[PDB]
Amino acid sequence: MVTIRLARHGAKKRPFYQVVVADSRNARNGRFIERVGFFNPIASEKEEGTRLDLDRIAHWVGQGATISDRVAALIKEVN
Amino acid sequence: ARYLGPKLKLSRREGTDLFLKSGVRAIDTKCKIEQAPGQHGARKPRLSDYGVQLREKQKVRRIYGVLERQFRNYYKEAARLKGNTGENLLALLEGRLDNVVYRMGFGATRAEARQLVSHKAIMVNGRVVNIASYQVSPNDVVSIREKAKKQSRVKAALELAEQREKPTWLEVDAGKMEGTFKRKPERSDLSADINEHLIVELYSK
Amino acid sequence: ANIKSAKKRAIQSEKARKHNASRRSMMRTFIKKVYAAIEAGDKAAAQKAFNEMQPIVDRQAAKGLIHKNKAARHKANLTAQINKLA
Amino acid sequence: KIRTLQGRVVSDKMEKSIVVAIERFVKHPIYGKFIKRTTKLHVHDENNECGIGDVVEIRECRPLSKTKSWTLVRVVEKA
RNA sequence: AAUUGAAGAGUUUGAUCAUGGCUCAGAUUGAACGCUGGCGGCAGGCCUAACACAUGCAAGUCGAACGGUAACAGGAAGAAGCUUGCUUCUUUGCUGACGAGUGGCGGACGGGUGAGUAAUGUCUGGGAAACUGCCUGAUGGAGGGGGAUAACUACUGGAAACGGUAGCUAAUACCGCAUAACGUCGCAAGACCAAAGAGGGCUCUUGCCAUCGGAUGUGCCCAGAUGGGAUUAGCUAGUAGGUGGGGUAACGGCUCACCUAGGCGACGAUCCCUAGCUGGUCUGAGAGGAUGACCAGCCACACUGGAACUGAGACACGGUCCAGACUCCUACGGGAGGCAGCAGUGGGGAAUAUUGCACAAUGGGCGCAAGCCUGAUGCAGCCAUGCCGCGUGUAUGAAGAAGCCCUUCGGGUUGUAAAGUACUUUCAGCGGGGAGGAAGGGAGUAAAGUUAAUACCUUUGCUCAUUGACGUUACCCGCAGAAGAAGCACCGGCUAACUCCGUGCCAGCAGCCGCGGUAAUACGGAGGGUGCAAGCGUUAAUCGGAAUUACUGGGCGUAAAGCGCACGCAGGCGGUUUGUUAAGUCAGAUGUGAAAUCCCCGGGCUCAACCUGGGAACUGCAUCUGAUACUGGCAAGCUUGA
RNA sequence: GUACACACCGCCCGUCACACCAUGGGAGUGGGUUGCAAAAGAAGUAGGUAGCUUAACCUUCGGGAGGGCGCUUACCACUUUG
Numbered sequence A: 001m002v003t004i005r006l007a008r009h010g011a012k013k014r015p016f017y018q019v020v021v022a023d024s025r026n027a028r029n030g031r032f033i034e035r036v037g038f039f040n041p042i043a044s045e046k047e048e049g050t051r052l053d054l055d056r057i058a059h060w061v062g063q064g065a066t067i068s069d070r071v072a073a074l075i076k077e078v079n
Numbered sequence B: 001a002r003y004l005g006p007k008l009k010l011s012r013r014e015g016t017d018l019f020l021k022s023g024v025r026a027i028d029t030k031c032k033i034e035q036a037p038g039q040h041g042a043r044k045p046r047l048s049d050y051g052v053q054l055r056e057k058q059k060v061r062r063i064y065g066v067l068e069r070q071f072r073n074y075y076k077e078a079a080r081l082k083g084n085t086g087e088n089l090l091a092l093l094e095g096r097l098d099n100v101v102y103r104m105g106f107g108a109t110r111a112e113a114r115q116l117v118s119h120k121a122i123m124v125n126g127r128v129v130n131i132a133s134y135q136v137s138p139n140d141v142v143s144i145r146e147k148a149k150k151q152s153r154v155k156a157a158l159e160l161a162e163q164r165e166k167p168t169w170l171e172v173d174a175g176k177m178e179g180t181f182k183r184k185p186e187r188s189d190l191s192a193d194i195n196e197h198l199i200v201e202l203y204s205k
Numbered sequence C: 001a002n003i004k005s006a007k008k009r010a011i012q013s014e015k016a017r018k019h020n021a022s023r024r025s026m027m028r029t030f031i032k033k034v035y036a037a038i039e040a041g042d043k044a045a046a047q048k049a050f051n052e053m054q055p056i057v058d059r060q061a062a063k064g065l066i067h068k069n070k071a072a073r074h075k076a077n078l079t080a081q082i083n084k085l086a
Numbered sequence D: 001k002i003r004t005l006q007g008r009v010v011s012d013k014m015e016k017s018i019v020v021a022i023e024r025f026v027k028h029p030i031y032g033k034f035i036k037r038t039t040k041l042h043v044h045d046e047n048n049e050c051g052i053g054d055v056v057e058i059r060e061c062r063p064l065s066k067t068k069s070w071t072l073v074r075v076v077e078k079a
Numbered sequence E: 001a002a003u004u005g006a007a008g009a010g011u012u013u014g015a016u017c018a019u020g021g022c023u024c025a026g027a028u029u030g031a032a033c034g035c036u037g038g039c040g041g042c043a044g045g046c047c048u049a050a051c052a053c054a055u056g057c058a059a060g061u062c063g064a065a066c067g068g069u070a071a072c073a074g075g076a077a078g079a080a081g082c083u084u085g086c087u088u089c090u091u092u093g094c095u096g097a098c099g100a101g102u103g104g105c106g107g108a109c110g111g112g113u114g115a116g117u118a119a120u121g122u123c124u125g126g127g128a129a130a131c132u133g134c135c136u137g138a139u140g141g142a143g144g145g146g147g148a149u150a151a152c153u154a155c156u157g158g159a160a161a162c163g164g165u166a167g168c169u170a171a172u173a174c175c176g177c178a179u180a181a182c183g184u185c186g187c188a189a190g191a192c193c194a195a196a197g198a199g200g201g202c203u204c205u206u207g208c209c210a211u212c213g214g215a216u217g218u219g220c221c222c223a224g225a226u227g228g229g230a231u232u233a234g235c236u237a238g239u240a241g242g243u244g245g246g247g248u249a250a251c252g253g254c255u256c257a258c259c260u261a262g263g264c265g266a267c268g269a270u271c272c273c274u275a276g277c278u279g280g281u282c283u284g285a286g287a288g289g290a291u292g293a294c295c296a297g298c299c300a301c302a303c304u305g306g307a308a309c310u311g312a313g314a315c316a317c318g319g320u321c322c323a324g325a326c327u328c329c330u331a332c333g334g335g336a337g338g339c340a341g342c343a344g345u346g347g348g349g350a351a352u353a354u355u356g357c358a359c360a361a362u363g364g365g366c367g368c369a370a371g372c373c374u375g376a377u378g379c380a381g382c383c384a385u386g387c388c389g390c391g392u393g394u395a396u397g398a399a400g401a402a403g404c405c406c407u408u409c410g411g412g413u414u415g416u417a418a419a420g421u422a423c424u425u426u427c428a429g430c431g432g433g434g435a436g437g438a439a440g441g442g443a444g445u446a447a448a449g450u451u452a453a454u455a456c457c458u459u460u461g462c463u464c465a466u467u468g469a470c471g472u473u474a475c476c477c478g479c480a481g482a483a484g485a486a487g488c489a490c491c492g493g494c495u496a497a498c499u500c501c502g503u504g505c506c507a508g509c510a511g512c513c514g515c516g517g518u519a520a521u522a523c524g525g526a527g528g529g530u531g532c533a534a535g536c537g538u539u540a541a542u543c544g545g546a547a548u549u550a551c552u553g554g555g556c557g558u559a560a561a562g563c564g565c566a567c568g569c570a571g572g573c574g575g576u577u578u579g580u581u582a583a584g585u586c587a588g589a590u591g592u593g594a595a596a597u598c599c600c601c602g603g604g605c606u607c608a609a610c611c612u613g614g615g616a617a618c619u620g621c622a623u624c625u626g627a628u629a630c631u632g633g634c635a636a637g638c639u640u641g642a
Numbered sequence F: 001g002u003a004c005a006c007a008c009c010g011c012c013c014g015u016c017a018c019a020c021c022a023u024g025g026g027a028g029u030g031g032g033u034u035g036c037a038a039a040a041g042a043a044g045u046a047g048g049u050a051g052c053u054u055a056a057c058c059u060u061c062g063g064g065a066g067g068g069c070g071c072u073u074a075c076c077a078c079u080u081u082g
Ligand SMILES: [K+]
Pocket: C005, C008
């Protein structure tokens, strides 16, 4: 089904995650429907580690999109 | 990745002092600056337009101790940067941590400044930077490490710097052995001997 | 088959094939009866056959042997032909 | 409105079908000269109204045959 | 703010100008080879045989669907050597669990490759006749029965693979019946169609069926675009259209019968050759040209040819059936197999890596969950293959030392170069410290919700242990000592850099022009020099320079080039005025133009490469609303062309 | 005037002879690909039904319906011929 999950970009040993809405069947870094935010695990202080479009996420949840565990944790920490 | 050969030969080829020695003694006493190096150095062959352009580029490289690949990248950056490419190029070379350390008087020569930077004796904004090519922004503070403050070389270099003309764009405090890069040097601040237009033309060849 | 689930799948698909074919054959037999009655030209016989067929096509659609659209087509096609027979 | 094309009938021989030529003026990609280009469409004509040389308006529809996905709207001009 | 953009040279002649080809300087690469080689970061790495493949691994999971109990780990009970209260030995699915089996879901994803395909592909823009597991909204239902079957047991056929016969048994397996309408068929009246339980403590949770929605995915249609060849010009009978029947989820010659004779093509049909397409990439001032490796989208393929079955979805890489070539097993009757998953082997080749580690993170399958599976992925190994960073010391040092080379023997040069002297310790080495990638999950604890219930379950705080493959991590600190760290091409002109000796049209060099026959800056060595530098050269290949296919941006009296002349269809183009239209054109708006990339302004790794936020751009296409000069259409003229 | 420039003792054309290289024709010969006209018919699917057989439904308990197997036909891969 439609899911909200983290696509792993960035460089080796320095992960950067794009938060995307995707058909779950597609590859992690493959075809996605929409980008709704990002998560930087190693973001420096004074730099925004996580940004999420809650309105777009909420819209997709309304349409029955599931949320990955990590994205759910990120939503909690954001709000 | 660095030139380790005799320094004065480079100045002799260029025909001008490249400040590759401390300047404690005159270059003329140290070498025959006028004569080009080697057996046929006394002969002065006519130089082609390409030759003139090449020699200007080599001079600037030899002054700052930059190899061709890095120098080419500087040119490309200067051309990309808005404004005068030739002026941008000289500004980039001036912004190098290596050059800044020498101009602040912490190093007697750019090579000496290089060793200081490389050997982690230099801090920028209170953080240790050991990269010669590091670009210093305006309002950055360059200071010697407390451990390295005791070094005799640094004190000697400061004395030599007093003899030399003081850069307007750099504010340096001796004893404290810290300096501030107030602004990027203007073309007027740099020597008019260098003809940057020849370098820009050469890279358009 | 190299993989265990594939081996099991082959057995289950074969069992499913036999079950489906039997139902598919039966459904077609009843549909053929309606067409035969229409060919005969007996409206009453055609309607009687149609009435026996209708529950079968509907149920098989529900079972997923055929699509509901296919069941609808069979009913629609036959109804039109029987009405013309009148 | 409904998207329509206007063209000249070039064949009316088929039963309930016509071949219509649509003219398009296109700038040449390299040379930049405006050139006339022709597209021929098989069109459904229920009443066989249209005749060769007629100017007609046609609209896109569901496939009606192997080569027909357009239908006649009106006959703008008779030959 | 998203810009800033454009170099020539050599060579035809006795000399000249022009023309014109050839050649060179640049940038680039999945490179290869030769010589050389310190370190790190990031990335890349079978371009050839879509050749053949040893071995291991790449798809399972669910006991909260089911009969069970092969294990093991207990328990209980009963016997026991009798620790005289444990131990041993049996029985008992009794329980934690759990082999094999039934059933569910997954196996159509993820991963590989580019053979085929010049369009049943791709790209852009539209469109109608569809279906869509899991997810999600709404409204209802969820009654009552039946016949089986695997496992198992007995027997039995085979060398094996794989079976056969009989008996027994369960379900969320299977099949009636009831129920039946915002469902299906029907003008209507009517007719017809489903379901499944399981778990926790009556209640809660979850599952099941029906219909209608959404979302996602997918099928289908149209227009434009998308290689080369005319020394391929005609092609086509399901062909093109119609009518009716059948078929599909769905429109449709999709199929068939009948009818009509169409349909396509110089705006290149058909045939031949080549080729996966795109975002992009390289080059270029641009316009172009070339290209499609990595990354992402789409397509196609899975030993070869063919076929269906199951399923929401496949005509299915690690499924089924058939045929074939290959390899293999065999008791000769008959069997088995498919690395273009990862690693690896042989082979081919100028040439391309380890039979590594881990599921810690991200993501995927199954599961209530714990978890299990995951060669996806994260990492590590190998390789200067590329990009980027850094080091190989640094000041002082005339004795202008030796030694070399050159020399008119005065000297000059190597060269401040080396010694010598004074310092520094990056990196490498040794030692000691030490982030972050970790979110969650598990126990408890309280409140709230729920309910008959302070139960259970859910939610949210709370508390306590705990989860890192990389890993001897990044990073930091200390120690010792210049120690452990420079090569490659070139020096006649183009083209930066010159002499001596050897050789004597030889040996050899060579991109072009050329060089070599005894005073060679051109061969070979040496001294010196130039350019690059952990690389440097050479070869291959693309674009550039080439305005040398010229759209931007060229020519045709004599350099290559006006058809021998003319008429003329198609085509291109067309005097002047008014009105009208608004097609071109222009303006604005809207939708779309995937993300990445490129560009601009920023942020993060000590810098950079690299990573990343936002913007700009995507020059296009469609639609809507306007403008009407020009062009086109239409109407009416006009007289100057005819 | 010139096609000469160590400059008419200049320049320069073709056959013939010898060597070598690429290429056309050539009795034909051997491969690849492919058109046309036929032959062929594994498996599968669909249509039909000599026969054989059959859990669930129906039944008057005899059977019936329906199903399966077999057989047959159509389509078609291998393959074959001109
Ligand atoms: K299973």
